[PDB]
Amino acid sequence: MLYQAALKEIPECIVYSKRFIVPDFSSYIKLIPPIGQEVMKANPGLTLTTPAYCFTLYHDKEYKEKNMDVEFCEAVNDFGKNEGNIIFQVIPAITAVTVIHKGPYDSLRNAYIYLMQWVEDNGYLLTNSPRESYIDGIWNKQDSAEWMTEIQFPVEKV
Ligand SMILES: CCCCCCCCCCCCCCCC[N+](C)(C)C
Ligand SMILES: CCCCCCCCCCCCCCCC[N+](C)(C)C
Ligand SMILES: [Cl-]
């Protein structure tokens, strides 16, 4: 796939979120559906933002694929009440270099490789946790070649 870096300012947002140490990506994503179900039950009237912004924060300090520190986030228009370890928080504004990963998730690492190289080549520094923003996927497209996930590296120019 031919990744195409873009540079953008991402404003702050309010999210509901849950943080996990996960064995691998498949194990992690099985934990995601219950989060929305439980937070919505506990906060009638909670509204997702339009457009949506639904993303994983990868909090590890190095590249990893197993035993990962991940935080699932989904943007809402206003705060609700925390439900268990599901917590509302403000995710701060960042300047990000981004690429779109088309297709299934087994090759997501290629987008991270690409962005790590771009940051080095163009005189930037990664300054906060990468975000993995889910756009199109099994919820709306059964042709997995048409899934779309945006990888966002928070950066500052050196
Ligand atoms: C000079 C710095 C060298 C590289 C810094 C990399 C920091 C790593 C950022 C957090 C870990 C990202 C893990 C993403 C895994 C995503 N997939 C499971 C989908 C592949
Ligand atoms: C029988 C085959 C079972 C397939 C299970 C499919 C479950 C799909 C549940 C999707 C949850 C996706 C969460 C990402 C949120 C989507 N938005 C980006 C639109 C907010
Ligand atoms: Cl320069």
Author numbering: 112 to 269
Text taken from the publication that reported this structure:
Bacterial RNA polymerase (RNAP) holoenzyme initiates transcription by recognizing the conserved –35 and –10 promoter elements that are optimally separated by a 17-bp spacer. The MerR family of transcriptional regulators activate suboptimal 19–20 bp spacer promoters in response to myriad cellular signals, ranging from heavy metals to drug-like compounds. Here we report one crystal structure of a multidrug-sensing MerR family regulator EcmrR and nine cryo-electron microscopy structures that capture the EcmrR-dependent transcription process from promoter opening to initial transcription to RNA elongation. These structures reveal that EcmrR is a dual ligand-binding factor that reshapes the suboptimal 19-bp spacer DNA to enable optimal promoter recognition, sustains promoter remodeling to stabilize initial transcribing complexes, and finally dissociates from the promoter to reverse DNA remodeling and facilitate the transition to elongation.
Although the CTDs of EcmrR (residues 112–269) and BmrR are highly divergent in sequence, their three-dimensional structures are readily superimposable. Both CTDs belong to GyrI-like domain family, a well-characterized motif that is adapted for multidrug binding. Dual site-binding is also observed in the 1.4 Å EcmrR CTD crystal structure, wherein both sites are occupied by cetyltrimethylammonium cation (CTA+), a cationic detergent in the crystallization solution. The overall shape and pocket residue conformations of site I remain largely unchanged between the CTA+- and TPSb+-bound forms except for a slight retraction of the E185 side chain to avoid clashes with one of the phenyl rings in TPSb+. In comparison, site II is relatively flexible and undergoes significant conformational changes between its un-liganded, CTA+-bound and CHAPSO-bound forms. Y174 and R220, which partially occupy site II in the absence of ligand, gradually lift up as a ligand binds and as the bound ligand gets bulkier. The two ligand-binding sites in EcmrR are approximately symmetric about a pseudo-two-fold axis of the triangle-shaped EcmrR CTD. A glutamate residue in each site (E185 and E243) dictates the preference for cationic compounds, while the lack of a positive charge in the tetracyclic sterol head of CHAPSO is compensated for by hydrogen bonds between its hydroxyl groups and polar residues on the surface of site II and extensive hydrophobic interactions in the ligand-binding pocket.
